[PDB]
Symmetry: C4
Subunit: 25 residues, 4 copies
Amino acid sequence: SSDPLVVAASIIAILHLILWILDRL
Amino acid sequence: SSDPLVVAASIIAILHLILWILDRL
Amino acid sequence: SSDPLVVAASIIAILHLILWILDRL
Amino acid sequence: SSDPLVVAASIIAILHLILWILDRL
Ligand SMILES: N[C@]12C[C@H]3C[C@H](C[C@H](C3)C1)C2
C-alpha cells in the first residue's frame, strides 16, 4: 500500500488531466 | 508505507493546488 | 507496493515529460 | 516501499519545483 497523502495527491493529478481534456475538448 | 521523496513531491503538489486556488482571490 | 491510483497518476507524469522533450527536441 | 515508476515520477516532480525556485517569487 501507499500513503494516504499520496493517494490524494494523485487523485488531484488525475482530476486535473480530466478538466484539461474537457477544457481542450 | 510510501517512499519519502514520494511524500515530498506530494506535499508540493497539494501545496501547489493551494497556492493556485488562492491565486483566484 | 504502491496503490494503483498512484501508479496511474505517475504514468501520466512520466508521459507528460515525454510529450515535452519531444515537443521541443 | 512505493513503486519505482512512482519514485521516478517524483524526481521529475521535485526537479520541476527546483527549476522553478530558480526562476520566480
Ligand atoms: N504530481 C504527482 C506527485 C507525486 C508522484 C506522482 C503521483 C502523485 C504523487 C502526483 C505525480
